Each structure stands twice: as structure tokens, then as C-alpha cells.
Amino acid sequence: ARLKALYNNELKQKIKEELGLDNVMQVPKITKITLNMGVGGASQDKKLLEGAVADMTAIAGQKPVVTKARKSIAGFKIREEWPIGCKVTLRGEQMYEFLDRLIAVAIPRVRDFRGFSPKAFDGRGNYSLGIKEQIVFPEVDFDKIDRIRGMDVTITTSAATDDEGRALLKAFGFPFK
Amino acid sequence: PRSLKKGPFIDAHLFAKVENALETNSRKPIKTWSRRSMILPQMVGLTLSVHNGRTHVPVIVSEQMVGHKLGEFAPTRTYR
Amino acid sequence: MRKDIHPDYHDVLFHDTNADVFFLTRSTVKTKTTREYEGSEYPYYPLDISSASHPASFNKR
Amino acid sequence: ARIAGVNIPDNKHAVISLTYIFGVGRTTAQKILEAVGIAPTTKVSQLDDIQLDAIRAQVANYMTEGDLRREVSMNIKRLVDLGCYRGIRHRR
RNA sequence: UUACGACCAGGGCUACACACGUGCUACAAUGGUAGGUACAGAGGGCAGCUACACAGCGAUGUGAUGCGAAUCUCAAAAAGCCUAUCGUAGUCCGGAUUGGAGUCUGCAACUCGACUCCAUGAAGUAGGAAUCGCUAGUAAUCGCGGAUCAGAAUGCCGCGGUGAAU
RNA sequence: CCUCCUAAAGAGUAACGGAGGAGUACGAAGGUGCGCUCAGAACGGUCGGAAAUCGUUCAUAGAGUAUAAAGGCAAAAGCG
């Protein structure tokens, strides 16, 4: 990952000088990146989930895992332990490569993309963004496709504060505002 | 709409009422029946009372209403 | 990383041809052609756009 | 191909495929192809990347879907919020 | 009979949960589009039609010419034929609705005009019970004129083209 | 036949007293080793909301325990 080798040389010290931190262990870093896909309409066809798992595999470069229903809800017609989503978690080299790819290649491919909301942090430095169409990732090809799916990209960082989280995200080149 | 070569249309009788209103800088609502006169930026800010057939409903003219006719903001029919 | 359960993950040379900027990054994509960078010949992927190229009336008439 | 952020059909002719872009009809596509220099009878699939990016640059002039939908929606809003007759029919 | 008479301005006759009656345009390949190349009749024109030239993507605008017309003009007929393409897709079908910019007529185009241009691209893939017209230059289909009319026909009244089945 | 109360702080204790369950289930839902921690609330996030899946922060248990109730349960007796 080139972004990890760039953060370990330039971005860390730049973030420290920016936030005015008196200790190098205070500057934030991204701990993990989690890609999720709610396929709640599954357990009735169980082919939508197959396609979602394939899309997650191609997008992330890592075999994902099927997430079951933690409770039974009649309104969503779901019973316990029913496969209703897909998730993958990327750490270290895999997450740095994925985030570099997402910022460079894939994030300009969002249709009518003005920017990403800067108030979308949860309040502890972690960011979450939604991708309404999984074709913005070049890994998935337009010829063979099940349908148009979406995905959550949650960036979990070591920042404890909103402002530190967005400073760390913006140091990487994240498209904000 | 109209022809650009002809020029903007404003009734002379209401144009006189606004030449006797923007020099004075009054806020008196000018009461008018000519809905066929286009709102120009000349009287932007003041108030007119446009006849909608039954009553003289008030139209305070704004900055983004110029170019429209005075009747556009005085509906004549009542659906419900 | 568990062995042989993950997809093929290899370096890919993405290239924004509008600004002619390269992005070397491992990815799951399988490109048809392969173009040589300063190192070896990576699978080459053209790009239409990337992070380098993406971004009164009365008086007139 | 991929022009103006959408995936226009590849097996169609250029002048027909480009109309799939919201904001490009057939005469605007004809004018785009006149400037670029490509015959409207050539398939988009057999189009070189250099001329594909030339067509992208030529398209970047006209207000396509990303800007067009915003501008049209705000144009409608300018009448809906104004309370004029046209806006009163627009809301209903 | 200082009003149920009379005059003026604005609005309405153009509203739409809806229903029905007459139609027009379609749902395409016996077709759409782009190039060429043909063949009419009838009617209108000073309350006007405009040759031609230039400007404009266009509607149109300016100059200018002929003609009260078997003289000049509306005006090019379209369907048709040849070539290319589309290759059965809600599409290169369909063109409603909406956004923007204009041209004319007219004191005046908001309610509430007609056209032009660009963008959008809705339903619609042949239609239930039921029901209508037509016996030959007819039906079907294709264009073109006129009355009313400053402007405003998919209606009305006509004209010819191709042209059946039973 | 089981659980609570009546039942008077050991046990037991009646009424055609007041309230509920049982006449099964399971070859794993048993044994062991190893590992894990729930419910809810708030915040952020494509469809996706009051509530699906994902991330964060609080959270001795306000959950779960095959089933009635009681008593228990972190060495979990709960979950893989």
C-alpha cells in the first residue's frame, strides 16, 4: 500500500502540526474499513445474496462473510439466523489499498457527485458513506451484472474527536463538503 | 411571450403611478387593474394591489419576480 | 489472511488518460491489456476520470 | 463506453448512443460529432480512447444530467415557492 | 322602464375526484431516419400572394421584383421509386408533459395564442362487454386548398394521388 | 404431577381458597476441550423506515436459559 507508506512519512507529522498535538501517539489513524450490504430482501430468493457476496468479493479483494438476523422481525419478514446481509472488514495493507483506490478511481465515478457531507461523522471520528451503485468500482463489469446494488463504507479511525477524525480523513485527500 | 425587438410592455397609467412612487419612495400599495403589465426591476421592492376579477389582492414585488406579468400572482379561479 | 479463500489480488496500473496520470494499486480487476510502468508490465486499466480530473435577465434583454 | 458519468450503450451508433445521456438529444449529439470529427455511423464500441476523451471534453460544455437535473429542479422551485399561477399548478 | 335598459375596466365562457359523445396521433419493419428522383387537381391573392438576394439551425427579418392574375405568386404535393441504415428493442417506435430561449399578429399572448429551436421523453406492444361506416374509383390510405379569420383547425366544406376485399 | 401464595423468617400444614403449568422435547438441545458475551438507547451510514445489516459509545443482564413459575446462573447454568 502506497497510502500507508505515505501516511507513515508525511501525513502523520502533517496531522500532528495541524491539530497541534504534543505527542505522536495522539494523531489519529484509520484502524479498519468495513464494507456492508444489507440484502434484507434475501431469505426469499437467496440469489440476491449470492450476487451481493460476489460483488463484495470483487470490490474489496477479500472474501466477505454473510451476516444473519440477530432478532426476528415480522415487519421485514425475517426470522432469527436468516442471512440478510454481507460484510467485510479490511485492516492494514488491504484497507490502505482499498481506501487509496476508492479515493482515486472510484469516488469520482459516483453519478452527480458534488461532495461528501462533513457532518456524517458519528461523533467519535468514524465516518460512514453510502454508495448507491456498486458499478463505480471498476472491478465489477457492466456486461455481467445481477442488478444495481449499494454498499456502506464505514471508516473506523483511532480519533476520539469529530475534528480529529475529519482532519485525518482530509489529510488523505478525501473529497469533503 | 413577446418580441424582443418590440421591447418590454408596461401600461402607461401604471408606469406613471410608479414614476410617482419611486421618486417619493413610498410604501403605499398602488391599486391597479392592469394585469397585462410586466413587472420590471424599476419598482422592485414596493407593493401593488392587482385586481383578480373579484378583489384587489396584494402583491409585494420581489427581486425574482421581474419579467413576469402582474396577473401571474393574482389567480382568478378558486379550485376548492 | 487465510490461504486460498480470497480472490486474486494483483497490482493494477489504473491510468486517467484525460490528465495522463497513473495510479499503481493492487486490485481484483483483470485487465485485457498490460502496459509497462517504470518497473514491470502491470495490467493496464484506462480511466475516464479520477481524482486528478474530477471537479438581471430583464437588464440583458 | 462511459461518457458524462453514464454507461451509454456500446453496440449502437455514436449519434444514437449519445442521446442516452440526459441532456443530449440527437441534434446536440450531431453537433458534438461534427466538432469531434467522428462519423455518426460509427459504433461506439469501435471507438478509440483518444477520441472517446475528445467526445467527453466536447460533452463537458452542455449542461448534462448532473447539472441539468439540479438546474431544472431549481427552475421549477423558483416558481413553486413564488406562489405564481404556474407554480400553483406545478405543485398540484 | 335612475332598470331585466345603456357605457367602461378586469375576470369568466379555457376550473377538473369524474363520466360519456365525436375525432386526431400512435402503439412500428407493408416501418423510422438520411440522401437523391418523379407525377396532380381544385382554390385563394391589394382586408394581399410574394420571384430573387442576403442574415439566421429554424420560425422568420431586411431589400427588392411580378401580379387584380390561364401572365406573377401561394407552391414544394405527399404517399411513390433507387441507395444506405436501423434489426424487434418501450427501440433510431410513439411525441404527450415539462424546463429554457425566440419569431409573428395584435393596444395588449399572465389567466388564455400559433409556430420555431434545444433539452426531457408519458402512456401506449393492438385494446372487455359491446358497437360503427363502407358495394368501386367505393372503402382504406396520402397529401393540397378554402370559409370564418389581425392571430388562432386534429372541426367543417371541398380537391386530386394510390387504390382494394366481398 | 409441577411452580407461586395462603404457610404465622427450619420442615410440614387445610378450604368447591387466590393464580398458573404438565402427561413432553433433544444423538444434540448430551460429554469434553477451547472460545465468546446479552437487551436496549443514542450517533453515523444505499435502498432501509420506529424497527433488518454495518460502525461507534454507554450498558451486572433492564437479555437468554426447549417449556409454567420460582429459585438460580460470569468459573456463566447463557452463546458458538
XYZ file of C-alpha atoms (C1' of nucleotides) in Angstrom:
656
model
C 0.000 0.000 0.000
C 1.380 3.369 -1.061
C -1.029 5.300 1.164
C 0.266 3.559 4.293
C 3.861 4.353 3.313
C 2.804 7.954 2.663
C 0.932 8.351 5.956
C 3.902 6.948 7.870
C 6.183 9.622 6.369
C 4.189 12.786 5.609
C 0.572 12.630 6.755
C 1.285 11.719 10.384
C 3.558 14.705 11.046
C 1.311 16.996 8.994
C -1.712 15.936 11.073
C 0.255 16.479 14.276
C 1.270 20.001 13.243
C -2.266 20.736 12.023
C -4.112 19.680 15.176
C -1.379 20.969 17.488
C -0.784 17.703 19.336
C 2.114 17.354 21.767
C 2.519 13.584 21.381
C 2.892 11.394 18.301
C 0.536 8.774 19.759
C -2.286 11.338 19.759
C -2.570 11.838 15.991
C -5.439 9.774 14.544
C -5.098 6.817 12.232
C -7.615 4.629 10.455
C -7.999 1.300 12.227
C -10.327 -0.502 9.822
C -12.684 -0.114 6.880
C -15.916 -2.119 6.842
C -17.992 -2.659 3.697
C -21.580 -3.712 4.380
C -24.504 -4.705 2.156
C -27.981 -5.043 3.617
C -29.702 -7.664 1.457
C -32.791 -7.746 3.656
C -34.876 -8.916 0.720
C -32.966 -12.193 0.786
C -34.108 -15.360 2.592
C -36.877 -15.356 -0.029
C -34.658 -15.772 -3.098
C -31.116 -16.305 -1.726
C -29.601 -15.415 -5.098
C -29.541 -11.704 -4.401
C -27.223 -12.607 -1.533
C -25.060 -14.684 -3.879
C -24.666 -11.692 -6.176
C -24.021 -9.350 -3.255
C -21.281 -11.640 -1.932
C -19.704 -11.813 -5.389
C -19.814 -8.020 -5.712
C -18.270 -7.557 -2.262
C -15.541 -10.075 -3.104
C -14.621 -8.270 -6.313
C -14.872 -4.789 -4.767
C -12.848 -5.419 -1.616
C -10.406 -8.082 -2.770
C -11.302 -10.136 0.300
C -13.812 -12.913 0.836
C -16.737 -11.403 2.779
C -18.968 -13.014 5.385
C -22.748 -13.415 5.445
C -24.423 -11.619 8.346
C -27.520 -13.203 9.891
C -30.580 -11.712 11.552
C -29.839 -11.011 15.211
C -33.563 -10.886 16.027
C -36.862 -11.895 14.448
C -38.899 -9.075 12.893
C -42.243 -9.677 11.196
C -42.386 -6.272 9.517
C -39.312 -7.169 7.481
C -40.467 -10.815 7.255
C -37.165 -12.009 8.729
C -36.597 -14.807 11.232
C -33.622 -15.422 13.512
C -30.336 -16.557 11.966
C -31.525 -15.700 8.478
C -28.887 -14.462 6.050
C -29.841 -10.825 5.468
C -26.560 -9.119 4.754
C -22.930 -9.243 3.743
C -19.900 -7.611 5.307
C -16.138 -7.454 5.001
C -13.576 -5.757 7.222
C -10.236 -4.557 5.859
C -7.227 -3.778 8.037
C -3.678 -2.634 7.434
C -2.426 -3.106 3.898
C -5.768 -4.239 2.480
C -7.664 -1.272 3.913
C -5.000 1.235 2.871
C -5.032 -0.088 -0.694
C -8.833 -0.128 -0.781
C -9.124 3.427 0.519
C -6.494 4.691 -1.923
C -8.379 3.019 -4.771
C -11.718 4.351 -3.520
C -10.488 7.936 -3.241
C -8.613 7.959 -6.556
C -10.534 5.773 -9.005
C -13.989 5.025 -7.638
C -15.161 8.161 -5.807
C -15.161 10.323 -8.987
C -17.360 7.679 -10.647
C -20.324 8.431 -8.371
C -23.021 9.887 -10.609
C -23.647 13.568 -9.822
C -21.054 13.696 -7.058
C -20.652 17.191 -5.618
C -19.052 16.159 -2.331
C -19.419 14.135 0.837
C -21.162 15.537 3.886
C -18.695 16.675 6.585
C -21.314 16.179 9.331
C -21.618 12.456 8.590
C -19.154 11.505 11.316
C -20.840 9.686 14.177
C -19.207 11.995 16.729
C -16.117 9.910 17.542
C -14.021 10.323 14.400
C -15.501 7.436 12.413
C -17.007 8.174 9.015
C -19.724 6.388 7.072
C -20.634 6.837 3.422
C -23.199 5.216 1.161
C -22.564 4.103 -2.409
C -25.885 3.873 -4.240
C -24.484 1.967 -7.241
C -21.755 -0.656 -6.963
C -20.640 -0.094 -10.579
C -18.461 2.874 -9.597
C -15.848 0.276 -8.646
C -14.018 -0.810 -11.828
C -13.667 -4.366 -10.501
C -17.325 -5.122 -11.272
C -18.035 -5.123 -15.008
C -21.167 -3.776 -16.672
C -21.588 -6.767 -19.008
C -22.200 -9.386 -16.307
C -24.348 -7.901 -13.541
C -27.220 -9.153 -11.405
C -28.667 -5.709 -10.645
C -27.644 -2.344 -9.208
C -26.693 -2.708 -5.542
C -25.402 -0.338 -2.895
C -22.909 -0.524 -0.081
C -21.859 1.125 3.159
C -18.219 2.109 3.597
C -17.538 2.737 7.282
C -14.087 4.141 8.042
C -13.283 3.396 11.686
C -10.400 5.571 12.884
C -8.415 5.941 16.092
C -9.595 9.537 16.508
C -11.570 10.304 19.655
C -12.972 13.632 18.431
C -15.008 14.771 15.439
C -12.473 17.375 14.314
C -9.529 14.975 14.580
C -11.410 12.402 12.521
C -12.105 14.825 9.688
C -8.572 16.238 9.779
C -7.236 12.695 9.403
C -9.689 11.921 6.605
C -8.873 15.160 4.764
C -5.119 14.594 5.068
C -5.589 11.571 2.783
C -7.334 13.659 0.128
C -10.940 12.795 0.960
C -13.491 14.801 -1.080
C -15.397 16.733 1.568
C -18.083 19.427 1.673
C -44.286 35.827 -24.589
C -43.451 38.861 -26.738
C -40.896 40.068 -29.275
C -37.526 41.333 -28.088
C -37.431 43.858 -30.936
C -40.697 45.392 -29.713
C -39.488 45.866 -26.151
C -40.971 45.397 -22.693
C -44.650 46.216 -22.298
C -45.889 48.270 -19.363
C -49.154 50.193 -19.265
C -48.657 53.952 -19.309
C -51.136 54.535 -16.485
C -49.327 52.186 -14.087
C -45.905 53.351 -15.250
C -46.960 56.857 -14.225
C -48.035 55.502 -10.831
C -44.550 54.057 -10.327
C -42.768 57.183 -11.565
C -44.868 58.889 -8.880
C -43.836 56.209 -6.378
C -40.093 55.506 -6.722
C -39.109 59.177 -6.552
C -41.337 59.536 -3.488
C -40.095 56.209 -2.035
C -43.499 55.492 -0.513
C -44.800 52.102 0.591
C -48.426 52.788 -0.325
C -49.811 49.765 -2.237
C -50.587 51.022 -5.727
C -54.063 49.743 -6.615
C -54.207 48.551 -10.224
C -56.401 46.589 -12.626
C -53.870 46.155 -15.464
C -52.680 42.582 -15.008
C -51.220 42.782 -18.537
C -48.177 44.820 -17.442
C -44.828 43.091 -16.944
C -43.012 43.563 -13.633
C -39.741 45.367 -14.379
C -36.929 45.862 -11.836
C -37.859 49.567 -11.729
C -40.376 49.189 -8.895
C -38.743 46.167 -7.228
C -39.457 46.382 -3.511
C -42.834 48.109 -3.419
C -46.400 46.801 -3.281
C -49.233 46.671 -5.802
C -52.863 45.602 -5.388
C -53.750 43.725 -8.566
C -57.383 43.090 -9.441
C -58.114 39.372 -9.856
C -61.674 39.896 -11.099
C -63.265 39.976 -7.645
C -60.823 41.827 -5.363
C -57.529 43.727 -5.409
C -55.234 41.095 -3.960
C -51.861 42.395 -2.694
C -48.635 41.509 -4.497
C -45.434 42.711 -2.861
C -42.936 42.691 -5.712
C -39.660 40.839 -5.146
C -36.308 40.613 -6.912
C -37.019 37.278 -8.632
C -40.471 38.279 -9.922
C -39.288 40.759 -12.564
C -40.108 39.793 -16.131
C -43.446 38.303 -15.083
C -46.848 39.833 -15.654
C -48.682 41.305 -12.680
C -51.525 38.816 -13.127
C -49.311 35.764 -12.620
C -49.536 36.317 -8.844
C -53.267 37.131 -8.804
C -55.126 33.882 -9.507
C -58.692 34.376 -10.705
C -60.272 30.936 -10.240
C -60.810 29.112 -6.943
C -60.478 25.332 -7.153
C -61.615 24.430 -3.634
C -5.124 -13.791 5.785
C -6.479 -17.314 5.374
C -4.915 -19.178 2.473
C -6.608 -19.640 -0.931
C -10.048 -18.395 0.150
C -9.676 -14.835 -1.193
C -9.867 -13.625 -4.806
C -6.811 -12.915 -6.901
C -5.325 -9.603 -5.769
C -2.618 -8.159 -8.007
C -1.129 -4.766 -8.777
C -3.071 -2.838 -11.422
C -1.956 0.274 -13.308
C -5.013 2.494 -13.414
C -4.437 5.427 -15.760
C -6.506 8.597 -16.074
C -5.910 9.344 -19.754
C -7.512 12.802 -19.638
C -4.742 14.176 -17.419
C -2.474 11.180 -18.172
C -1.800 10.298 -14.533
C -1.060 6.793 -13.310
C -2.305 5.082 -10.143
C -0.473 1.889 -9.192
C -2.749 -0.053 -6.859
C -3.481 -3.711 -6.172
C -6.999 -4.637 -7.258
C -9.210 -7.573 -8.204
C -9.699 -6.313 -11.771
C -8.462 -8.455 -14.670
C -7.482 -6.099 -17.482
C -7.299 -7.220 -21.101
C -4.048 -5.375 -21.880
C -0.817 -4.868 -19.940
C 1.292 -1.703 -20.122
C 4.762 -1.271 -18.662
C 5.293 1.262 -15.884
C 8.748 2.318 -14.667
C 9.003 -1.187 -13.191
C 7.419 -4.284 -14.717
C 4.404 -4.571 -17.045
C 1.262 -4.179 -14.957
C -2.303 -4.937 -16.068
C -3.316 -1.585 -17.534
C -6.772 -0.118 -16.895
C -7.799 3.098 -18.689
C -9.902 5.567 -16.722
C -12.340 8.179 -17.983
C -11.992 10.173 -14.747
C -10.061 10.049 -11.480
C -9.160 12.272 -8.530
C -6.969 14.457 -10.772
C -9.592 15.405 -13.380
C -12.855 15.312 -11.428
C -14.013 18.789 -10.286
C -30.763 40.836 -14.249
C -32.258 38.903 -17.154
C -34.529 41.873 -17.847
C -31.418 44.058 -17.980
C -29.770 41.731 -20.502
C -32.887 41.727 -22.700
C -18.328 3.235 -23.230
C -18.592 5.684 -20.319
C -19.427 9.300 -21.190
C -20.641 12.071 -18.867
C -20.804 9.669 -15.935
C -23.266 7.233 -17.533
C -22.786 3.915 -19.325
C -24.022 4.655 -22.837
C -24.722 1.567 -24.995
C -21.720 0.285 -26.919
C -23.306 -1.594 -29.839
C -25.235 1.464 -31.051
C -24.086 4.164 -33.419
C -22.416 7.153 -31.796
C -25.162 9.653 -32.643
C -27.831 7.360 -31.160
C -25.904 6.151 -28.112
C -25.030 9.694 -27.064
C -28.739 10.526 -26.746
C -28.873 8.190 -23.734
C -27.139 10.975 -21.788
C -29.781 13.063 -20.024
C -29.223 16.439 -21.651
C -28.130 15.205 -25.072
C -30.758 14.636 -27.735
C -29.998 13.816 -31.354
C -29.187 17.250 -32.778
C -26.890 18.093 -29.866
C -25.188 14.729 -30.389
C -24.877 15.522 -34.101
C -23.246 18.855 -33.260
C -20.885 17.126 -30.822
C -19.819 14.648 -33.502
C -19.307 17.449 -36.045
C -16.843 19.191 -33.730
C -15.076 15.984 -32.685
C -14.783 14.717 -36.260
C -16.307 11.222 -35.994
C -18.874 9.904 -38.450
C -22.286 9.422 -36.768
C -22.499 5.987 -38.432
C -19.593 4.550 -36.412
C -20.320 2.247 -33.492
C -19.369 3.450 -30.029
C -17.821 0.037 -29.312
C -15.164 0.501 -32.013
C -14.180 3.977 -30.792
C -10.611 4.875 -29.858
C -9.842 6.065 -26.338
C -8.321 9.355 -27.525
C -11.478 10.272 -29.440
C -13.576 8.938 -26.561
C -11.908 11.506 -24.301
C -12.292 14.138 -27.025
C -16.033 13.412 -27.027
C -16.012 13.622 -23.226
C -14.380 17.055 -23.378
C -16.871 18.169 -26.034
C -19.788 16.931 -23.905
C -18.459 18.782 -20.844
C -19.793 22.022 -22.385
C -23.518 21.243 -22.446
C -25.445 21.046 -19.181
C -25.750 17.275 -18.792
C -27.723 15.278 -16.240
C -25.738 16.119 -13.114
C -26.105 19.849 -13.671
C -29.282 19.669 -15.770
C -31.445 17.960 -13.155
C -30.249 20.393 -10.487
C -30.933 23.412 -12.697
C -34.346 22.179 -13.858
C -35.427 21.310 -10.314
C -34.325 24.728 -9.060
C -36.087 26.387 -12.011
C -39.298 24.624 -11.004
C -38.665 25.543 -7.359
C -38.307 29.217 -8.308
C -41.963 29.080 -9.421
C -43.298 26.664 -6.789
C -42.018 28.800 -3.907
C -43.022 32.037 -5.647
C -46.734 31.248 -5.411
C -47.391 32.277 -9.009
C -50.045 30.588 -11.136
C -47.540 28.357 -12.919
C -46.067 27.237 -9.602
C -49.527 26.631 -8.146
C -50.165 24.194 -10.989
C -46.639 22.787 -10.622
C -47.137 21.755 -7.003
C -50.501 20.072 -7.628
C -88.702 51.290 -17.525
C -82.486 56.140 -12.420
C -83.580 49.246 -14.898
C -84.125 42.811 -16.567
C -82.375 49.284 -20.438
C -77.062 51.720 -21.503
C -71.401 52.618 -21.228
C -66.225 51.084 -19.436
C -62.001 48.121 -16.996
C -60.747 43.487 -15.024
C -62.230 38.403 -14.839
C -65.187 34.150 -16.728
C -67.266 31.284 -21.025
C -60.394 27.763 -21.153
C -61.631 25.333 -13.465
C -61.457 19.176 -13.006
C -62.413 13.336 -7.841
C -65.147 12.108 -12.798
C -68.414 10.073 -16.934
C -69.887 9.904 -21.977
C -70.110 11.515 -27.479
C -67.266 12.861 -31.924
C -62.316 12.865 -33.651
C -56.506 13.291 -34.290
C -51.866 10.991 -33.246
C -49.855 6.269 -32.174
C -48.502 1.516 -30.327
C -43.977 0.466 -35.673
C -40.040 -3.300 -40.183
C -46.219 -3.242 -45.607
C -41.954 0.808 -40.813
C -38.440 5.218 -38.715
C -34.375 8.181 -40.388
C -30.736 10.302 -44.034
C -29.653 11.338 -49.247
C -31.296 11.751 -54.238
C -35.548 11.290 -58.331
C -40.642 11.901 -60.181
C -46.420 12.512 -61.159
C -51.911 16.305 -59.509
C -56.361 18.634 -59.083
C -59.035 22.463 -57.144
C -58.957 27.020 -54.708
C -57.046 31.699 -52.908
C -54.066 36.599 -53.691
C -54.439 44.858 -52.919
C -58.873 43.160 -45.873
C -52.763 40.569 -50.394
C -49.617 36.425 -52.584
C -44.681 37.062 -52.989
C -39.793 35.786 -57.631
C -34.740 36.709 -56.253
C -30.624 38.175 -52.928
C -28.711 38.493 -48.134
C -28.935 37.124 -42.399
C -30.489 33.292 -39.336
C -30.272 25.948 -37.122
C -35.324 27.420 -37.693
C -39.974 30.070 -37.155
C -38.877 34.427 -39.601
C -36.348 39.574 -40.798
C -34.459 43.314 -44.468
C -34.016 44.963 -49.534
C -36.396 44.113 -53.989
C -39.427 42.092 -58.370
C -44.061 40.379 -60.828
C -49.210 40.111 -60.474
C -56.250 42.178 -59.607
C -53.902 37.328 -62.209
C -54.635 30.850 -67.987
C -49.311 36.384 -67.437
C -46.655 36.870 -61.218
C -47.478 34.073 -56.704
C -49.291 30.876 -52.791
C -46.195 26.136 -54.193
C -42.880 22.317 -52.766
C -47.638 17.909 -53.399
C -47.159 13.808 -50.253
C -47.945 8.677 -50.428
C -44.465 6.653 -54.754
C -39.285 4.849 -56.790
C -33.481 3.968 -56.006
C -29.389 3.566 -52.045
C -27.731 3.258 -47.065
C -29.051 2.321 -42.113
C -31.889 0.699 -38.033
C -32.948 -5.475 -36.884
C -37.849 -6.198 -32.957
C -35.987 -3.120 -28.717
C -40.875 0.526 -24.994
C -36.297 0.889 -29.500
C -33.157 5.392 -34.392
C -41.220 3.382 -32.424
C -44.521 6.896 -30.181
C -44.237 12.672 -29.160
C -47.774 13.773 -24.532
C -45.841 16.556 -20.480
C -42.365 19.700 -18.560
C -37.586 23.407 -18.437
C -35.063 27.180 -21.341
C -34.535 30.634 -25.479
C -37.155 33.069 -29.512
C -40.437 34.806 -34.070
C -45.030 36.874 -35.557
C -50.253 39.039 -35.063
C -52.268 42.344 -32.085
C -53.116 48.370 -27.502
C -52.117 44.045 -25.157
C -50.218 36.319 -25.596
C -50.479 36.010 -17.055
C -55.235 33.880 -16.814
C -55.608 32.233 -22.298
C -52.475 32.369 -28.988
C -49.918 29.751 -33.026
C -45.487 28.473 -34.632
C -39.644 27.819 -34.163
C -35.227 25.873 -31.727
C -32.643 22.899 -27.783
C -33.437 19.530 -23.739
C -36.936 15.966 -21.467
C -39.231 11.682 -23.320
C -45.502 9.894 -20.587
C -48.931 6.384 -21.599
C -49.049 3.270 -25.488
C -46.656 -3.552 -27.710
C -53.357 -3.705 -30.997
C -57.490 -2.688 -26.788
C -63.615 -6.201 -22.215
C -68.835 -6.387 -22.620
C -70.304 -4.067 -26.649
C -70.635 -1.329 -31.145
C -69.920 1.742 -36.301
C -69.021 3.023 -41.662
C -68.480 1.110 -46.389
C -70.904 -2.479 -52.653
C -65.969 0.741 -56.958
C -62.604 4.938 -58.454
C -66.077 2.995 -53.226
C -63.575 1.544 -48.501
C -58.520 2.233 -46.842
C -54.552 5.444 -47.101
C -51.759 10.182 -48.829
C -51.156 14.886 -49.212
C -53.367 20.051 -51.051
C -56.822 24.213 -50.767
C -60.973 27.437 -48.819
C -64.878 29.880 -45.314
C -64.795 32.054 -40.622
C -60.297 34.852 -39.639
C -55.412 40.726 -37.051
C -53.622 35.960 -34.842
C -55.898 31.180 -33.534
C -58.369 23.659 -37.021
C -56.984 17.431 -35.258
C -63.545 20.580 -36.745
C -66.422 21.983 -41.331
C -66.520 22.430 -46.749
C -64.015 20.805 -50.942
C -59.655 18.751 -54.397
C -56.854 15.380 -56.512
C -52.994 10.744 -55.819
C -52.668 5.443 -54.909
C -56.318 2.042 -54.649
C -58.806 -2.968 -52.720
C -61.888 -7.348 -50.395
C -66.539 -9.335 -50.684
C -47.895 -34.428 38.919
C -45.069 -29.318 38.901
C -44.482 -23.557 40.385
C -46.071 -19.297 43.477
C -49.113 -17.580 47.564
C -52.155 -18.952 51.773
C -47.861 -21.074 55.210
C -47.548 -17.403 61.172
C -38.378 -15.895 58.819
C -36.282 -24.551 59.822
C -39.757 -28.656 57.768
C -44.776 -29.648 57.266
C -49.699 -27.545 57.272
C -56.477 -27.046 55.156
C -60.747 -24.988 52.280
C -65.785 -26.219 45.932
C -59.058 -20.555 48.878
C -56.138 -16.866 45.028
C -53.028 -17.552 40.426
C -50.559 -20.536 36.524
C -48.399 -25.108 34.097
C -47.511 -30.871 32.960
C -48.980 -36.135 30.642
C -43.267 -33.698 26.666
C -38.594 -32.391 23.825
C -33.493 -33.430 22.282
C -27.989 -38.331 19.220
C -27.715 -32.919 20.189
C -30.684 -29.282 22.893
C -25.803 -34.984 25.956
C -19.823 -35.354 27.216
C -15.348 -32.654 26.796
C -11.732 -29.009 25.282
C -11.475 -24.292 23.504
C -13.535 -19.726 22.661
C -17.401 -15.678 23.295
C -20.955 -12.218 25.872
C -26.653 -10.066 26.154
C -31.189 -6.466 25.995
C -31.821 -1.757 24.940
C -30.611 3.696 23.907
C -28.024 7.450 21.208
C -24.933 8.990 16.922
C -23.281 7.991 11.523
C -24.495 5.188 7.278
C -27.715 2.879 -0.220
C -32.298 1.184 -0.986
C -33.877 0.937 4.703
C -38.320 3.138 7.829
C -39.889 3.344 14.718
C -37.542 -1.343 13.842
C -33.132 -5.592 9.081
C -27.466 -5.412 8.085
C -22.740 -2.224 9.221
C -19.582 1.122 12.570
C -19.048 3.857 17.339
C -20.205 4.954 22.548
C -22.867 3.820 27.127
C -24.858 -0.625 29.102
C -24.358 -6.886 36.147
C -28.035 -8.618 32.435
C -33.030 -3.831 32.166
C -31.331 -10.351 27.709
C -31.123 -15.541 27.334
C -31.911 -20.139 29.674
C -36.572 -26.021 24.543
C -41.159 -25.023 28.058
C -45.040 -22.665 33.569
C -43.330 -20.356 37.719
C -39.946 -19.899 41.487
C -35.116 -20.182 42.894
C -30.523 -19.730 40.287
C -26.874 -18.576 36.552
C -19.884 -14.655 34.818
C -15.688 -20.378 36.533
C -21.607 -18.177 33.274
C -26.175 -22.922 34.084
C -26.494 -18.069 28.509
C -23.845 -18.284 23.060
C -20.534 -20.687 19.175
